[PDB]
Amino acid sequence: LANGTVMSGSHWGVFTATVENGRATAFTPWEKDPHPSPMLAGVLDSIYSPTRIKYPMVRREFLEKGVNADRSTRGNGDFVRVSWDQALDLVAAEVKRVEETYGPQGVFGGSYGWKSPGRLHNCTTLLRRMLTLAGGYVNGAGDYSTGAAQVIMPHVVGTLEVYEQQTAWPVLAENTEVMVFWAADPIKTSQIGWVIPEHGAYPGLEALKAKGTKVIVIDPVRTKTVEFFGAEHITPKPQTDVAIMLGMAHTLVAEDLYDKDFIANYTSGFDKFLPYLDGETDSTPKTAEWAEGISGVPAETIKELARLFESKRTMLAAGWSMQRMHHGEQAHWMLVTLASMLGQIGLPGGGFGLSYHYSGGGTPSTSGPALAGITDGGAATKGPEWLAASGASVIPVARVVDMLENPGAEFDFNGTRSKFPDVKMAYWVGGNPFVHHQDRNRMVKAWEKLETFVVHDFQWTPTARHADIVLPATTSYERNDIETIGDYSNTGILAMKKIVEPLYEARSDYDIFAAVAERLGKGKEFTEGKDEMGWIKSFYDDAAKQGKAAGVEMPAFDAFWAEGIVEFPVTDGADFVRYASFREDPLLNPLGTPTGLIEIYSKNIEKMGYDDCPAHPTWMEPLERLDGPGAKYPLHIAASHPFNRLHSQLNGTVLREGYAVQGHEPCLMHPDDAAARGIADGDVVRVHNDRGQILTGVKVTDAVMKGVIQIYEGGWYDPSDVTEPGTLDKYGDVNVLSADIGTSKLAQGNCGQTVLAEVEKYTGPAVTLTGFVAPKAAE
Ligand SMILES: NC1=NC(=O)C2=N[C@H]3C(S)=C(S)[C@@H](COP(=O)(O)OP(=O)(O)OC[C@H]4O[C@@H](n5cnc6c(=O)[nH]c(N)nc65)[C@H](O)[C@@H]4O)O[C@H]3NC2=N1
Ligand SMILES: NC1=NC(=O)C2=N[C@H]3C(S)=C(S)[C@@H](COP(=O)(O)OP(=O)(O)OC[C@H]4O[C@@H](n5cnc6c(=O)[nH]c(N)nc65)[C@H](O)[C@@H]4O)O[C@H]3NC2=N1
């Protein structure tokens, strides 16, 4: 049995594993990581925990009755263990049956999810590679993170903006005087990366503090970002940020402070927005006092902030929770409108940035080459012959339950109309929709429309528990791969070396899909005649050739593999100022909008005629909001990202012991809200509204503002009885309480943070948690 050390990486960073007798026993952070995540110990434990999936399983009802199975019992744990050969034969026959019977519109292959990094073992791209060979599939578009912002930005500034490099951290340290974290908690959300993280935000944040820059945080919760800086903390009622921004803009106009020259030369449509702001159009001037009545933030604080931003070099760093809500498109559109009025866009240290809290945005980029990986093949095909009727081949990701309930119905998206396809099977890998999607009770019933549901994962999540066919995948630590370090920085390239042998009967997603492609008669087309190391070497060799051209020297493949990593040099990346060339000469360097300027009023959006997405930033009432007129429930739930998980990942590990309260997901509650209900620290409470009910464990703190409770997304849904409609969730999946609606007709984004509920001390019968041990038949 092996003894020794091996270096690899993950969504949480680079590390060295210690192996003793063939088992990994410690993960130690990379010596060059400036700020390792405390979640690394849970990553190691996820390889071996009680919920690791050991064998291929088929739901007993599905095995016995196929398409005639009773579909309401999915999730009760009644599984049968089968051999790999039987399982692969069944999956392959079901994929082919559905493709022949219903066409490519019958298979949903969107499979949204965070999976693991790795250019070769990219389970979702491998899924689409196989489905392409099978005849086609319906895909998803956009994502759950910036579903609204990524669609409105191209109409305002011309590009996506949210996933683009920010003005560099060192430029901010030398030039910014006031830094604003608006609906952003960079300390919390910078621990992970899509590719391997370099944790570049931490040194950037430390340099701002050492310089004594004034930091302001606008967030209903007193986060570690607030605590690290001793920041001035503004706490708006959730979903009222647009009203605050309008009251700031109104103040800048009334006191005649705003930058008229910036507005005149770099923007379009401000004259059509002004009348709205002043109340000429609706008899309601959007003053600081009007904003105070909606948001609860004192009118004079709103005014002082507006003056301060106008007089100092200010960076408006905004996060994404405020656009993960009804009418989310207005939040960042109004933010950019406010930034335009301040006139600092394109100056070193000023303007705005939408990715300082995500994957190291602002960390200086190197001059290295880009690494490429396996593809789904669609780019070199001639896929399905598609046409309306059968419906759209792509849907906005968060409309997956609407699609299932309304096959053939039309939906709007960014100015076009499309039809939902009639899906009969879904194949999910690397994602956990029975945790990540909204309105769980609705989704549970809608899922009965699917004949067949196949899932691959290495943990028994609620999604795998609901499958008809469950196949055990390996982790990244049981295979070899290659990946970039740094989504924006491109710090280097890492060899993700195998640490231990595959556990139990687990197989990589690549091997499972290759075996399904082989039964479809298309094995060589899937594999390309290459094995694991052959694929990895060809990605490396391609990057090395690109590197050569550009003057970046890289070692041959085997020398790179022996070292385990290659790092690239930073040339001018540390001086990058976003929008500087636009500011310097807007005629030579225009934005990619219809006018070539920042569009405060959009004629294009005006033509779409959407009632829920007007042609300029607008305050509109959401479905439900804290203290809204006629609101039924009293507390807003901040259903934000978990500090000690990556969404649902790591919930079934030893780290859960450090935050669970009586075994359940924690609920943070203000002392006065607790006292009014007779709730004490540590009590189990029932959190409920008209869509669902869950149990959580309370931690009483004044870190959350009064009227707000914090229950993070990601908890593993553990239903008392899958056949009972609206059954109680014993663990605390906050998406049992959210509503499943689009942000607007423009983007159709999810509204996972538009949530109100009531809380009461739980006094019902004691409950047994069953989500963190495998189903009995899977032991
Ligand atoms: N540790 C960690 N775990 C993760 O699961 C994780 N997920 C990653 C992903 S996939 C993404 S897309 C990014 C998401 O990054 P994003 O900015 O969406 O993160 P959230 O945790 O949803 O919200 C950030 C802050 O917004 C505050 N907030 C909520 N509602 C409001 C509001 O109405 N107004 C204001 N002003 N603030 C509000 C919350 O209290 C929270 O502190 O995080 C990434 N980083 C992650 N880190
Ligand atoms: N209410 C609410 N508020 C929110 O703020 C919120 N955030 C949204 C956001 S921004 C996103 S990005 C989504 C995230 O939702 P997402 O489904 O991406 O969440 P994860 O828990 O990372 O699911 C990843 C799954 O892939 C598995 N996996 C990892 N590697 C592999 C592999 O190699 N092979 C296979 N077969 N499986 C693998 C993991 O074990 C895990 O179960 O949540 C969204 N949901 C949200 N809801």
Regarding whether 237 and 136 lie in a shared domain, the answer is: no
CA 515 to chain centre: 31
Give the alpha-carbon dihedral of 247, 249, 255, 259, to 10 degrees. 170
678 annotated to bind ligand = no
Closest CA to ligand 1's atom 8: 189
**How far apart, in whole angstroms, are the C-alpha atoms of residue 177 and residue 173?**
9
CA nearest 190: which of 223, 149, 218? 223
**How far apart, in whole angstroms, are the C-alpha atoms of residue 612 and residue 29?**
47
Domain membership flag for residue 37: no
Closest CA to ligand 2's atom 11: 144
Closest CA to ligand 1's atom 45: 189
Regarding whether 545 and 582 lie in a shared domain, the answer is: no
Kind of pairing between the strands at 666-669 and 684-688:
unpaired
**How far apart, in whole angstroms, are the C-alpha atoms of residue 31 and residue 483?**
19
Regarding whether 760 and 653 lie in a shared domain, the answer is: yes
**How far apart, in whole angstroms, are the C-alpha atoms of residue 49 and residue 46?**
5
CA nearest 348: which of 167, 470, 494? 167
Give the distance (Å) from ligand 1 centre to CA of residue 131: 33
Which DSSP symbol is given to 334? Answer: H
Give the distance (Å) from ligand 1 centre to CA of residue 320: 6
Instruction: Give the atom of ligand 2 at the shortest distance from the alpha carbon of 714.
Output: 21
C-alpha pair distances (Å), 63 with each of 36, 90, 424, 588, 637: 46, 9, 17, 65, 41
Domain membership flag for residue 678: yes
CA nearest 717: which of 462, 516, 544? 462
Domain membership flag for residue 40: no
- The position carrying tokens 């399905």 is 384
Give the distance (Å) from ligand 2 centre to CA of residue 471: 18
- Element housing 276 (H / E): helix 270-277
Q: Which phi and psi (to 5°) does residue 178 adopt?
A: -130, 120
Sorted by sequence, the CB contacts under 8 Å of residue 309 that are 6+ apart come out as: 178, 180, 248, 316, 342
735 annotated to bind ligand = yes
C-alpha pair distances (Å), 629 with each of 29, 129, 359, 633: 51, 50, 39, 11
- Element housing 454 (H / E): strand 452-457
**How far apart, in whole angstroms, are the C-alpha atoms of residue 628 and residue 580?**
41
Regarding whether 203 and 92 lie in a shared domain, the answer is: no
Give the distance (Å) from ligand 2 centre to CA of residue 647: 6
Regarding whether 394 and 292 lie in a shared domain, the answer is: no
Regarding whether 383 and 354 lie in a shared domain, the answer is: no
> Within 6 Å (CB) of ligand 2, which residues are found?
113-116, 121, 123, 144-145, 324, 429-432, 435-436, 456-459, 461, 473, 509, 639-641, 646-649, 713, 734-735, 738, 752-753
Which DSSP symbol is given to 48? Answer: T
714 annotated to bind ligand = no
**How far apart, in whole angstroms, are the C-alpha atoms of residue 508 and residue 476?**
9
Sorted by sequence, the CB contacts under 8 Å of residue 774 that are 6+ apart come out as: 50, 51, 52, 53, 54, 460
Give the alpha-carbon dihedral of 194, 200, 201, 206, to 10 degrees. 160
CATH code for position 546:
3.90.55.10
Which DSSP symbol is given to 368? Answer: P
**How far apart, in whole angstroms, are the C-alpha atoms of residue 636 and residue 438?**
16
- The position carrying tokens 């050390």 is 5
- Element housing 630 (H / E): none
428 annotated to bind ligand = no
The β-bridge partners of 263 are none
Closest CA to ligand 1's atom 15: 320
Domain membership flag for residue 767: yes
Regarding whether 357 and 417 lie in a shared domain, the answer is: no
Regarding whether 395 and 285 lie in a shared domain, the answer is: no
Determine the number of helices (DSSP H) and then strands (DSSP E) in the chain: 26, 29
Reply yes or no on whether 477 is catalytic: no
**How far apart, in whole angstroms, are the C-alpha atoms of residue 686 and residue 729?**
9
Judged by DSSP in three states, 221 sits in: strand
> Which structure tokens are listed for 350?
């000023």
Regarding whether 152 and 112 lie in a shared domain, the answer is: no
CATH code for position 336:
3.40.228.10
- The position carrying tokens 């406010």 is 338
- Element housing 351 (H / E): strand 351-353
Q: Of the ligands numbered here, which is closest to the C-alpha atom of 458?
A: 2
- List the catalytic residue out of 30, 55, 112, 477: 112
The β-bridge partners of 29 are 15
**How far apart, in whole angstroms, are the C-alpha atoms of residue 108 and residue 428?**
9
- Element housing 434 (H / E): helix 433-436
Give the distance (Å) from ligand 2 centre to CA of residue 113: 5
Domain membership flag for residue 152: yes
Furthest CA-CA distance within the chain:
79
- The position carrying tokens 């990244």 is 476
**How far apart, in whole angstroms, are the C-alpha atoms of residue 30 and residue 17?**
10
> Which structure tokens are listed for 541?
């060799």
C-alpha pair distances (Å), 759 with each of 481, 635, 694, 713, 769: 47, 8, 10, 17, 20
Which DSSP symbol is given to 649? Answer: B
Sorted by sequence, the CB contacts under 8 Å of residue 127 that are 6+ apart come out as: 109, 111, 427, 429, 509, 513
**Side chain identity, residue 234:** I
112 annotated to bind ligand = yes
CA 776 to chain centre: 32
**How far apart, in whole angstroms, are the C-alpha atoms of residue 646 and residue 653?**
12
DSSP string for 386-422: --SSS--SEEEGGGHHHHHHSTT-EEEETTEEEE---
Q: Which phi and psi (to 5°) does residue 205 adopt?
A: -65, -40
Q: Of the ligands numbered here, which is closest to the C-alpha atom of 650?
A: 2
Give the distance (Å) from ligand 1 centre to CA of residue 19: 35
**How far apart, in whole angstroms, are the C-alpha atoms of residue 56 and residue 81?**
6
Domain membership flag for residue 45: no
Give start and end residues of each alpha helix (H) in 591-703. Answer: 603-608, 671-677
**How far apart, in whole angstroms, are the C-alpha atoms of residue 104 and residue 95?**
10
Regarding whether 550 and 630 lie in a shared domain, the answer is: no
Strand order of the β-sheet with 492-496 is 481-485, 492-496, 565-567
Does residue 708 contact residue 429 with C-beta atoms inside 8 Å?
Answer: no
Q: Count Cβ atoms below 10 Å from residue 751 Cβ, excluding itself.
A: 27
Regarding whether 722 and 617 lie in a shared domain, the answer is: yes
**How far apart, in whole angstroms, are the C-alpha atoms of residue 124 and residue 432?**
13
Pocket test for ligand 2, best of 120, 185, 191, 436 (most atoms within 8 A of CB): 436
Reply yes or no on whether 114 is catalytic: yes
**How far apart, in whole angstroms, are the C-alpha atoms of residue 341 and residue 653?**
49
Give the alpha-carbon dihedral of 253, 259, 261, 267, to 10 degrees. -80
Instruction: Give the atom of ligand 2 at the shortest distance from the alpha carbon of 456.
Output: 36
> Which structure tokens are listed for 485?
């370090």
Which DSSP symbol is given to 361? Answer: T
Pocket test for ligand 1, best of 11, 144, 233, 640 (most atoms within 8 A of CB): 640
**How far apart, in whole angstroms, are the C-alpha atoms of residue 669 and residue 702?**
7
- For 600-656, list the strands marked E by DSSP: 635-638
> Within 6 Å (CB) of ligand 1, which residues are found?
145, 182-185, 188-189, 191-192, 218-221, 223, 236, 238-239, 241, 319-322, 324, 357-358, 638, 640-643, 646-647, 753
In the chain, what is the straight-line distance between the N-terminal and C-terminal CA atoms, in Å?
25
- Tally of structural domains, the chain: 4
> Which structure tokens are listed for 135?
């005849």
Per the structure, the complete domain to which residue 304 belongs is given by 145-364+577-602
DSSP string for 57-74: EEEHHHHHHGGGS-GGGT
CA nearest 495: which of 120, 45, 110, 105? 120
Does residue 197 contact residue 18 with C-beta atoms inside 8 Å?
Answer: no
DSSP string for 502-539: PPTT-B-HHHHHHHHHHHTT-HHHHHTT--HHHHHHHH
Give the distance (Å) from ligand 2 centre to CA of residue 349: 34
Domain membership flag for residue 232: yes
Experimental method: X-ray
C-alpha pair distances (Å), 481 with each of 114, 555, 561: 17, 17, 11
Q: What is the CA radius of gyration of the chain?
A: 26
Give the distance (Å) from ligand 2 centre to CA of residue 433: 7
Which DSSP symbol is given to 733? Answer: -
Domain membership flag for residue 36: no
- List the catalytic residue out of 114, 194, 386, 610: 114
688 annotated to bind ligand = no
**How far apart, in whole angstroms, are the C-alpha atoms of residue 467 and residue 508?**
19
Regarding whether 114 and 156 lie in a shared domain, the answer is: no
